[PDB]
């Protein structure tokens, strides 16, 4: 520390403002901060979960779920940046981010404040967590500085975004692209694409299906698989069906399921589709799911198949054989931060009707869209040598320095003042010559 190092300051104290990442990704850019402010209402159980995407290169900050009587989560809302970055910028890179979660309210009739928080940073995407209960969170990492337990809600928790790789590319935001079309509801964007994530699902390898006839048909769930998506994705591939039985008609639908078990997206992949005897019957997958259709994080994908017969009787026995694999590409999905690190903040025993307050600052390197570029000057980052080495040193000593991704806010506040002991005006420039 001398004066200090703008980047370290920004990284460890994001509410302080942005600084350019001192890596090798030399683009003309501009630096911006976006706040996140939410007042979430606590449900009947007094318990809930905030899912944060600490490294998300863009306006999506997280999602809030309330916990319900029956032990299921129910989606409340997305937590976003104050304004929608893709409306103004085309490219983006996350510099630093911190968020605070605390209660700001005790309801009218309530005698006493009570409530606690458990939090973890998990090195995987949302659907990869084996246990998302308040208690279960605590073992999602072995890293002591990536978990915090039973922090009082009144005091609150601070989430600090720590890097998962530098020298990351600029990410295209989901920015609208100039387009005209006959449909009012037409939407054209240029999506986060670099570093796609690909899931491959072999749904069947000569899977035999056999069942008696039914008016309305017989529906099966061929497979269900955990995947992650926040933004646009596509499904490709093909199933091949064989049969000895004449006049079978196949229906097939893909469902993308949210974290709360709810259907987010439903797409008929093939409806009413006759099968010929002694031949391959192809069922291609050509699905594109746009960002705006994804109303909450996708947590799994499943495929249902309906089998029905034209004629039909009592005992008819409908049978088919199926073979093939599908590929689910989520665009830009493997970009570190896009899906990968997840910070969960769980609360419980909070009085029903009380407010859980979220306040955050996100810092970005940004490239303006064409219209803004006319009035927004861009520059290469400030050069200071040793900024990156200092960052590397700090992170290398992360555990001995106690630099957490999840803090009791009181401890983070102490850390701020313990660190940051120099911010020294600027000695004789004022008296130099």
Residues annotated within the binding site for a divalent metal cation are 23
Identity of the residue, 24 or 417, whose beta carbon is nearer to Ca ion in the bound complex: 24
State which of residues 109, 112, 167, 180 lies at the interface with Ca ion (CB under 5 A).
167
Binding partner selected for residue 47 from Ca ion, a copy of itself, none, CB under the kind-specific 5 to 8 Å limit = none
337 binds, among a copy of itself, Ca ion, none (CB under 5 to 8 A by kind): none
β-sheet bridge partners, residue 229:
298
User: Which window, 59-67, 255-263, 312-320, 343-351, contacts a copy of itself (CB under 8 A)?
Assistant: 343-351
What is the length of the chain? 433
Are residues 44 and 65 in contact, defined by beta-carbon separation less than 8 angstroms? no
The CB-of-52 to a copy of itself minimum distance in angstroms stands at 16
Q: Which stretch binds Ca ion (CB under 5 A): 166-174, 181-189, 249-257, 376-384?
A: 166-174
Q: How far apart, in whole angstroms, are the C-alpha atoms of residue 401 and residue 320?
A: 62
Residues 7-66, interacting with a copy of itself (CB under 8 A): 15-18, 23-28, 30-33, 35-39
**Contact with a copy of itself (CB under 8 A): which of 70, 71, 183, 314?**
183
Q: Could you tell me the two tokens for 186?
A: 């037409």
Q: Report the residue from 45, 133, 219, 226 that binds a copy of itself according to the rule CB under 8 A.
A: 226
Q: H or E segment at 416?
A: helix 409-418
- Minimum Å gap between C-beta 91 and a copy of itself is 9
Scan residues 20-59 and list those touching Ca ion (CB under 5 A). Answer: 24
Q: Considering CB distances under 5 to 8 angstroms, the limit depending on partner class, which of Ca ion, a copy of itself, none binds residue 190?
A: a copy of itself
Least distance from a copy of itself to the Cβ atom of residue 359, Å? 4
Contacts 24+ apart (CB under 8 A), 310-318: 310/247, 310/249, 311/247, 312/213, 312/215, 313/213, 314/213, 315/212, 315/213, 316/212, 316/213, 317/210, 317/211, 317/212, 317/213, 317/245, 318/209, 318/210, 318/211, 318/212, 318/213, 318/218, 318/245, 318/248
Annotate each residue in 363-402 with x if it binds a copy of itself (CB under 8 A) or - if it does not, as one string.
----xxxxxxxxxxxxxxxxxxxx-xxxxxxxxxxxxxxx
Which distant-in-sequence residues (6+ apart) come within 8 Å of 387 by Cβ? 5, 6, 7, 8, 22
Segment contacting Ca ion by CB under 5 A, of 41-49, 160-168, 239-247, 359-367? 160-168
The CA distance from 223 to 204, in Å, is 9
Give least dist CB 73 to a copy of itself, A.
17
Q: Go through 294-331 and write b for each residue having 16 or more CB atoms within 10 A of its CB, e for each that does not.
A: bebbbbbbebbbbbbbeeeeeebebebbbbbebebbbb
- The verdict on 354 binding a copy of itself (CB under 8 A) reads yes
Decide if 350 contacts 112 (C-beta within 8 A): no
Binding mask 272-311 for a copy of itself (x = CB under 8 A): x---x--xx-x-xxxxxxxxx-------------------
The entry of a copy of itself, Ca ion, none near residue 72 (CB within 5 to 8 angstroms by kind) is: none
Residue 53 region by backbone torsions, left for phi larger than 0, else alpha for psi between -120 and 50, else beta = beta
Which residues define the annotated binding site?
Answer: 23
Nearest partner of 89 among 20, 174, 169, judged by Cα: 174
Residue 314 contact among a copy of itself, Ca ion, none, beta carbon within 5 to 8 Å by kind: none
* SS3 of residue 321 by DSSP: strand
Query: Of 65 and 170, which has the nearer Cβ to a copy of itself?
Result: 170
Strand-pairing partners, residue 33, are 363
Scanning 210-218, 258-266, 310-318, 349-357 for contacts with a copy of itself by CB under 8 A, the matching segment is: 349-357
Smallest gap, in angstroms, from Cβ of residue 314 to a copy of itself?
Answer: 25
Binding region for Ca ion (CB under 5 A): 24, 167
């Amino acid at each position: 520390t001398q004066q200090i190092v703008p980047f370290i300051r920004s990284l460890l104290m994001p509410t302080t403002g942005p600084a350019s990442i001192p890596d090798d990704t030399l683009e003309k850019h501009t630096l911006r901060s976006e706040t996140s402010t939410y007042n979430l209402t606590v449900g009947d159980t007094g318990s809930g979960l905030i899912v944060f995407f600490p490294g998300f290169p863009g306006s999506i900050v997280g999602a809030h779920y309330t916990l319900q009587g029956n032990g299921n989560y129910k989606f409340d809302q997305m937590l976003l940046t104050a304004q929608n970055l893709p409306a103004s910028y085309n490219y983006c890179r996350l510099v630093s981010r911190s968020l605070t979660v605390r209660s700001s309210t005790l309801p009218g009739g309530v005698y006493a404040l009570n409530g606690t928080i458990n939090a973890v940073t998990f090195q995987g995407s949302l659907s990869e967590l084996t246990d998302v209960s308040y208690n279960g969170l605590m073992s999602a990492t072995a890293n002591i500085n990536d978990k915090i337990g039973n922090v009082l809600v009144g005091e609150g928790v601070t989430v600090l975004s720590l890097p998962t790789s530098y020298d990351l590319g600029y990410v295209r935001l989901g920015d609208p692209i100039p387009a005209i079309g006959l449909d009012p509801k037409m939407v054209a964007t240029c999506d986060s694409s670099d570093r796609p994530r690909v899931y491959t699902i072999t749904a069947a390898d000569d899977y035999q299906f056999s069942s008696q006839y039914q008016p309305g048909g017989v529906t099966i769930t061929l497979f269900s698989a955990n995947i992650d998506a926040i933004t646009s994705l596509s499904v490709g591939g093909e199933l091949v069906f064989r049969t000895s039985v004449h006049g079978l008609v196949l229906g097939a639908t893909i469902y993308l399921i949210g974290f709360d078990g709810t259907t987010v997206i439903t797409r008929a992949v093939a409806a009413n589709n006759g099968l010929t005897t002694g031949t391959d019957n192809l069922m291609p997958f050509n699905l594109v799911i746009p960002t705006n259709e994804i109303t909450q994080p996708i947590t799994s994908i499943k495929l249902e198949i309906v089998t029905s017969k034209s004629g039909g009787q009592a005992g008819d026995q409908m049978s088919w054989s199926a073979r093939g694999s599908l590929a689910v590409t989520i665009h830009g999905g493997n970009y570190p931060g896009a899906l990968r690190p997840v910070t969960l903040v769980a609360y419980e025993r909070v009085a029903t009707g009380s407010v859980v307050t979220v306040a955050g600052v996100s810092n970005f390197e940004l490239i303006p869209n064409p219209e803004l570029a006319k009035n927004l000057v861009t520059e290469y980052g400030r050069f200071d040598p040793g900024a990156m080495n200092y960052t590397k040193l700090i992170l290398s000593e992360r555990d001995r320095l106690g630099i957490k991704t999840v803090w009791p806010t009181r401890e983070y506040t102490d850390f701020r003042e313990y660190f940051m002991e120099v911010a020294d005006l600027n000695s004789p420039l004022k008296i130099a010559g």
